């Protein structure tokens, strides 16, 4: 399970903001699943200890 | 979108001009980061657009 | 003289309306 990441974990999460914005836009314009999961898992709660899993889920919505 | 640490640092400043200048600097840094992210996203979107319009025409045909 | 509120990653900007939701029920007793 390769999870190489840069030591500077400051600007890497900006693309996370863009990804979550895109996912929110897709679900709003194209409602596929309930939005309760989005409320439960919020990037601002710091509970995303595995951002790769969050990205995989977001892509799974694709 | 500055982190909570930046907000605490701003709150630490006592003199009104000092805190105002720190807030302006934080705004400038956030704007620069957002502009860099937007430019990178635009470049990536154009590179995807580098794919011929034949792709879109085939999508229409399907 | 009250226990510190568990922020739990719920920032509250000055003069900004915010909602706090903490899973722990202990705060319910205090409220």
PDB file of N, CA and C in Angstrom, chain B:
ATOM      1  N   UNK B   1      -9.783  31.538   4.205  1.00  0.00           N
ATOM      2  CA  UNK B   1      -9.516  30.138   4.453  1.00  0.00           C
ATOM      3  C   UNK B   1      -8.268  29.863   5.262  1.00  0.00           C
ATOM      4  N   UNK B   2      -7.706  30.876   5.917  1.00  0.00           N
ATOM      5  CA  UNK B   2      -6.495  30.679   6.701  1.00  0.00           C
ATOM      6  C   UNK B   2      -6.755  29.721   7.858  1.00  0.00           C
ATOM      7  N   UNK B   3      -5.715  28.983   8.236  1.00  0.00           N
ATOM      8  CA  UNK B   3      -5.835  28.001   9.300  1.00  0.00           C
ATOM      9  C   UNK B   3      -6.083  28.685  10.641  1.00  0.00           C
ATOM     10  N   UNK B   4      -6.562  27.894  11.606  1.00  0.00           N
ATOM     11  CA  UNK B   4      -6.836  28.431  12.935  1.00  0.00           C
ATOM     12  C   UNK B   4      -5.583  29.018  13.570  1.00  0.00           C
ATOM     13  N   UNK B   5      -4.410  28.468  13.248  1.00  0.00           N
ATOM     14  CA  UNK B   5      -3.168  29.025  13.773  1.00  0.00           C
ATOM     15  C   UNK B   5      -2.966  30.457  13.294  1.00  0.00           C
ATOM     16  N   UNK B   6      -3.266  30.722  12.021  1.00  0.00           N
ATOM     17  CA  UNK B   6      -3.146  32.081  11.503  1.00  0.00           C
ATOM     18  C   UNK B   6      -4.114  33.023  12.209  1.00  0.00           C
ATOM     19  N   UNK B   7      -5.343  32.565  12.457  1.00  0.00           N
ATOM     20  CA  UNK B   7      -6.308  33.397  13.169  1.00  0.00           C
ATOM     21  C   UNK B   7      -5.831  33.700  14.583  1.00  0.00           C
ATOM     22  N   UNK B   8      -5.272  32.699  15.267  1.00  0.00           N
ATOM     23  CA  UNK B   8      -4.733  32.932  16.603  1.00  0.00           C
ATOM     24  C   UNK B   8      -3.580  33.927  16.559  1.00  0.00           C
ATOM     25  N   UNK B   9      -2.708  33.807  15.555  1.00  0.00           N
ATOM     26  CA  UNK B   9      -1.599  34.745  15.425  1.00  0.00           C
ATOM     27  C   UNK B   9      -2.107  36.164  15.203  1.00  0.00           C
ATOM     28  N   UNK B  10      -3.142  36.321  14.375  1.00  0.00           N
ATOM     29  CA  UNK B  10      -3.740  37.639  14.180  1.00  0.00           C
ATOM     30  C   UNK B  10      -4.297  38.165  15.496  1.00  0.00           C
ATOM     31  N   UNK B  11      -5.004  37.311  16.240  1.00  0.00           N
ATOM     32  CA  UNK B  11      -5.568  37.737  17.517  1.00  0.00           C
ATOM     33  C   UNK B  11      -4.479  38.132  18.506  1.00  0.00           C
ATOM     34  N   UNK B  12      -3.290  37.536  18.388  1.00  0.00           N
ATOM     35  CA  UNK B  12      -2.206  37.865  19.308  1.00  0.00           C
ATOM     36  C   UNK B  12      -1.801  39.329  19.187  1.00  0.00           C
ATOM     37  N   UNK B  13      -1.744  39.849  17.962  1.00  0.00           N
ATOM     38  CA  UNK B  13      -1.349  41.237  17.760  1.00  0.00           C
ATOM     39  C   UNK B  13      -2.285  42.173  18.516  1.00  0.00           C
ATOM     40  N   UNK B  14      -1.700  43.178  19.167  1.00  0.00           N
ATOM     41  CA  UNK B  14      -2.445  44.121  19.994  1.00  0.00           C
ATOM     42  C   UNK B  14      -2.753  45.424  19.265  1.00  0.00           C
ATOM     43  N   UNK B  15      -1.734  46.083  18.719  1.00  0.00           N
ATOM     44  CA  UNK B  15      -1.951  47.346  18.026  1.00  0.00           C
ATOM     45  C   UNK B  15      -2.877  47.146  16.833  1.00  0.00           C
ATOM     46  N   UNK B  16      -3.837  48.062  16.679  1.00  0.00           N
ATOM     47  CA  UNK B  16      -4.791  47.954  15.574  1.00  0.00           C
ATOM     48  C   UNK B  16      -4.082  47.950  14.225  1.00  0.00           C
ATOM     49  N   UNK B  17      -3.154  48.867  13.933  1.00  0.00           N
ATOM     50  CA  UNK B  17      -2.467  48.800  12.632  1.00  0.00           C
ATOM     51  C   UNK B  17      -1.716  47.499  12.421  1.00  0.00           C
ATOM     52  N   UNK B  18      -1.110  46.947  13.474  1.00  0.00           N
ATOM     53  CA  UNK B  18      -0.352  45.708  13.325  1.00  0.00           C
ATOM     54  C   UNK B  18      -1.266  44.550  12.944  1.00  0.00           C
ATOM     55  N   UNK B  19      -2.390  44.405  13.650  1.00  0.00           N
ATOM     56  CA  UNK B  19      -3.325  43.334  13.325  1.00  0.00           C
ATOM     57  C   UNK B  19      -3.935  43.542  11.945  1.00  0.00           C
ATOM     58  N   UNK B  20      -4.220  44.795  11.579  1.00  0.00           N
ATOM     59  CA  UNK B  20      -4.756  45.061  10.248  1.00  0.00           C
ATOM     60  C   UNK B  20      -3.757  44.668   9.166  1.00  0.00           C
ATOM     61  N   UNK B  21      -2.480  45.004   9.361  1.00  0.00           N
ATOM     62  CA  UNK B  21      -1.461  44.633   8.385  1.00  0.00           C
ATOM     63  C   UNK B  21      -1.297  43.121   8.311  1.00  0.00           C
ATOM     64  N   UNK B  22      -1.344  42.441   9.459  1.00  0.00           N
ATOM     65  CA  UNK B  22      -1.243  40.985   9.449  1.00  0.00           C
ATOM     66  C   UNK B  22      -2.422  40.360   8.714  1.00  0.00           C
ATOM     67  N   UNK B  23      -3.629  40.887   8.935  1.00  0.00           N
ATOM     68  CA  UNK B  23      -4.799  40.384   8.223  1.00  0.00           C
ATOM     69  C   UNK B  23      -4.675  40.628   6.725  1.00  0.00           C
ATOM     70  N   UNK B  24      -4.170  41.800   6.335  1.00  0.00           N
ATOM     71  CA  UNK B  24      -3.969  42.079   4.917  1.00  0.00           C
ATOM     72  C   UNK B  24      -2.949  41.124   4.309  1.00  0.00           C
ATOM     73  N   UNK B  25      -1.868  40.838   5.038  1.00  0.00           N
ATOM     74  CA  UNK B  25      -0.870  39.896   4.541  1.00  0.00           C
ATOM     75  C   UNK B  25      -1.457  38.497   4.399  1.00  0.00           C
ATOM     76  N   UNK B  26      -2.269  38.074   5.370  1.00  0.00           N
ATOM     77  CA  UNK B  26      -2.923  36.773   5.269  1.00  0.00           C
ATOM     78  C   UNK B  26      -3.867  36.729   4.075  1.00  0.00           C
ATOM     79  N   UNK B  27      -4.619  37.808   3.852  1.00  0.00           N
ATOM     80  CA  UNK B  27      -5.500  37.869   2.692  1.00  0.00           C
ATOM     81  C   UNK B  27      -4.702  37.776   1.399  1.00  0.00           C
ATOM     82  N   UNK B  28      -3.572  38.481   1.328  1.00  0.00           N
ATOM     83  CA  UNK B  28      -2.739  38.425   0.131  1.00  0.00           C
ATOM     84  C   UNK B  28      -2.199  37.019  -0.099  1.00  0.00           C
ATOM     85  N   UNK B  29      -1.739  36.357   0.965  1.00  0.00           N
ATOM     86  CA  UNK B  29      -1.214  35.002   0.820  1.00  0.00           C
ATOM     87  C   UNK B  29      -2.303  34.033   0.375  1.00  0.00           C
ATOM     88  N   UNK B  30      -3.491  34.133   0.975  1.00  0.00           N
ATOM     89  CA  UNK B  30      -4.593  33.263   0.577  1.00  0.00           C
ATOM     90  C   UNK B  30      -4.999  33.523  -0.867  1.00  0.00           C
ATOM     91  N   UNK B  31      -5.036  34.794  -1.273  1.00  0.00           N
ATOM     92  CA  UNK B  31      -5.368  35.120  -2.654  1.00  0.00           C
ATOM     93  C   UNK B  31      -4.329  34.560  -3.613  1.00  0.00           C
ATOM     94  N   UNK B  32      -3.047  34.660  -3.256  1.00  0.00           N
ATOM     95  CA  UNK B  32      -2.000  34.114  -4.111  1.00  0.00           C
ATOM     96  C   UNK B  32      -2.126  32.601  -4.235  1.00  0.00           C
ATOM     97  N   UNK B  33      -2.387  31.915  -3.120  1.00  0.00           N
ATOM     98  CA  UNK B  33      -2.557  30.466  -3.175  1.00  0.00           C
ATOM     99  C   UNK B  33      -3.764  30.088  -4.026  1.00  0.00           C
ATOM    100  N   UNK B  34      -4.881  30.799  -3.850  1.00  0.00           N
ATOM    101  CA  UNK B  34      -6.075  30.510  -4.636  1.00  0.00           C
ATOM    102  C   UNK B  34      -5.832  30.766  -6.117  1.00  0.00           C
ATOM    103  N   UNK B  35      -5.128  31.851  -6.445  1.00  0.00           N
ATOM    104  CA  UNK B  35      -4.827  32.150  -7.840  1.00  0.00           C
ATOM    105  C   UNK B  35      -3.915  31.091  -8.444  1.00  0.00           C
ATOM    106  N   UNK B  36      -2.914  30.634  -7.688  1.00  0.00           N
ATOM    107  CA  UNK B  36      -2.042  29.575  -8.185  1.00  0.00           C
ATOM    108  C   UNK B  36      -2.827  28.294  -8.431  1.00  0.00           C
ATOM    109  N   UNK B  37      -3.704  27.926  -7.492  1.00  0.00           N
ATOM    110  CA  UNK B  37      -4.518  26.729  -7.676  1.00  0.00           C
ATOM    111  C   UNK B  37      -5.439  26.872  -8.881  1.00  0.00           C
ATOM    112  N   UNK B  38      -6.050  28.047  -9.048  1.00  0.00           N
ATOM    113  CA  UNK B  38      -6.936  28.270 -10.185  1.00  0.00           C
ATOM    114  C   UNK B  38      -6.173  28.193 -11.500  1.00  0.00           C
ATOM    115  N   UNK B  39      -4.972  28.771 -11.550  1.00  0.00           N
ATOM    116  CA  UNK B  39      -4.174  28.711 -12.770  1.00  0.00           C
ATOM    117  C   UNK B  39      -3.758  27.281 -13.085  1.00  0.00           C
ATOM    118  N   UNK B  40      -3.362  26.516 -12.065  1.00  0.00           N
ATOM    119  CA  UNK B  40      -3.009  25.117 -12.290  1.00  0.00           C
ATOM    120  C   UNK B  40      -4.212  24.326 -12.791  1.00  0.00           C
ATOM    121  N   UNK B  41      -5.381  24.550 -12.189  1.00  0.00           N
ATOM    122  CA  UNK B  41      -6.580  23.871 -12.649  1.00  0.00           C
ATOM    123  C   UNK B  41      -6.952  24.252 -14.068  1.00  0.00           C
ATOM    124  N   UNK B  42      -6.796  25.531 -14.414  1.00  0.00           N
ATOM    125  CA  UNK B  42      -7.074  25.973 -15.776  1.00  0.00           C
ATOM    126  C   UNK B  42      -6.115  25.328 -16.765  1.00  0.00           C
ATOM    127  N   UNK B  43      -4.834  25.233 -16.401  1.00  0.00           N
ATOM    128  CA  UNK B  43      -3.867  24.579 -17.277  1.00  0.00           C
ATOM    129  C   UNK B  43      -4.214  23.109 -17.472  1.00  0.00           C
ATOM    130  N   UNK B  44      -4.594  22.421 -16.394  1.00  0.00           N
ATOM    131  CA  UNK B  44      -4.967  21.014 -16.509  1.00  0.00           C
ATOM    132  C   UNK B  44      -6.225  20.861 -17.357  1.00  0.00           C
ATOM    133  N   UNK B  45      -7.197  21.757 -17.175  1.00  0.00           N
ATOM    134  CA  UNK B  45      -8.423  21.697 -17.962  1.00  0.00           C
ATOM    135  C   UNK B  45      -8.141  21.943 -19.437  1.00  0.00           C
ATOM    136  N   UNK B  46      -7.225  22.863 -19.746  1.00  0.00           N
ATOM    137  CA  UNK B  46      -6.843  23.088 -21.137  1.00  0.00           C
ATOM    138  C   UNK B  46      -6.111  21.879 -21.708  1.00  0.00           C
ATOM    139  N   UNK B  47      -5.242  21.253 -20.910  1.00  0.00           N
ATOM    140  CA  UNK B  47      -4.547  20.056 -21.371  1.00  0.00           C
ATOM    141  C   UNK B  47      -5.535  18.936 -21.670  1.00  0.00           C
ATOM    142  N   UNK B  48      -6.564  18.792 -20.835  1.00  0.00           N
ATOM    143  CA  UNK B  48      -7.649  17.868 -21.156  1.00  0.00           C
ATOM    144  C   UNK B  48      -8.341  18.307 -22.440  1.00  0.00           C
ATOM    145  N   UNK B  49      -8.577  19.614 -22.582  1.00  0.00           N
ATOM    146  CA  UNK B  49      -9.135  20.159 -23.813  1.00  0.00           C
ATOM    147  C   UNK B  49      -8.203  19.951 -24.997  1.00  0.00           C
ATOM    148  N   UNK B  50      -6.905  19.755 -24.749  1.00  0.00           N
ATOM    149  CA  UNK B  50      -5.993  19.432 -25.841  1.00  0.00           C
ATOM    150  C   UNK B  50      -6.447  18.180 -26.574  1.00  0.00           C
ATOM    151  N   UNK B  51      -7.173  17.299 -25.889  1.00  0.00           N
ATOM    152  CA  UNK B  51      -7.834  16.197 -26.569  1.00  0.00           C
ATOM    153  C   UNK B  51      -8.736  16.747 -27.664  1.00  0.00           C
ATOM    154  N   UNK B  52      -8.670  16.127 -28.838  1.00  0.00           N
ATOM    155  CA  UNK B  52      -9.384  16.649 -29.994  1.00  0.00           C
ATOM    156  C   UNK B  52     -10.881  16.718 -29.717  1.00  0.00           C
ATOM    157  N   UNK B  53     -11.543  17.672 -30.375  1.00  0.00           N
ATOM    158  CA  UNK B  53     -12.996  17.752 -30.306  1.00  0.00           C
ATOM    159  C   UNK B  53     -13.658  16.521 -30.906  1.00  0.00           C
ATOM    160  N   UNK B  54     -12.906  15.715 -31.660  1.00  0.00           N
ATOM    161  CA  UNK B  54     -13.424  14.433 -32.118  1.00  0.00           C
ATOM    162  C   UNK B  54     -13.897  13.580 -30.951  1.00  0.00           C
ATOM    163  N   UNK B  55     -13.274  13.726 -29.780  1.00  0.00           N
ATOM    164  CA  UNK B  55     -13.746  13.008 -28.600  1.00  0.00           C
ATOM    165  C   UNK B  55     -15.163  13.436 -28.236  1.00  0.00           C
ATOM    166  N   UNK B  56     -15.418  14.746 -28.231  1.00  0.00           N
ATOM    167  CA  UNK B  56     -16.763  15.232 -27.939  1.00  0.00           C
ATOM    168  C   UNK B  56     -17.750  14.796 -29.015  1.00  0.00           C
ATOM    169  N   UNK B  57     -17.327  14.811 -30.280  1.00  0.00           N
ATOM    170  CA  UNK B  57     -18.215  14.379 -31.355  1.00  0.00           C
ATOM    171  C   UNK B  57     -18.560  12.899 -31.223  1.00  0.00           C
ATOM    172  N   UNK B  58     -17.580  12.070 -30.856  1.00  0.00           N
ATOM    173  CA  UNK B  58     -17.851  10.657 -30.619  1.00  0.00           C
ATOM    174  C   UNK B  58     -18.769  10.469 -29.417  1.00  0.00           C
ATOM    175  N   UNK B  59     -18.598  11.294 -28.382  1.00  0.00           N
ATOM    176  CA  UNK B  59     -19.518  11.246 -27.251  1.00  0.00           C
ATOM    177  C   UNK B  59     -20.939  11.566 -27.697  1.00  0.00           C
ATOM    178  N   UNK B  60     -21.096  12.574 -28.557  1.00  0.00           N
ATOM    179  CA  UNK B  60     -22.419  12.890 -29.090  1.00  0.00           C
ATOM    180  C   UNK B  60     -22.973  11.724 -29.901  1.00  0.00           C
ATOM    181  N   UNK B  61     -22.128  11.099 -30.723  1.00  0.00           N
ATOM    182  CA  UNK B  61     -22.577   9.971 -31.533  1.00  0.00           C
ATOM    183  C   UNK B  61     -23.056   8.823 -30.654  1.00  0.00           C
ATOM    184  N   UNK B  62     -22.322   8.526 -29.581  1.00  0.00           N
ATOM    185  CA  UNK B  62     -22.781   7.511 -28.639  1.00  0.00           C
ATOM    186  C   UNK B  62     -24.062   7.949 -27.941  1.00  0.00           C
TER     187      UNK B  62
END
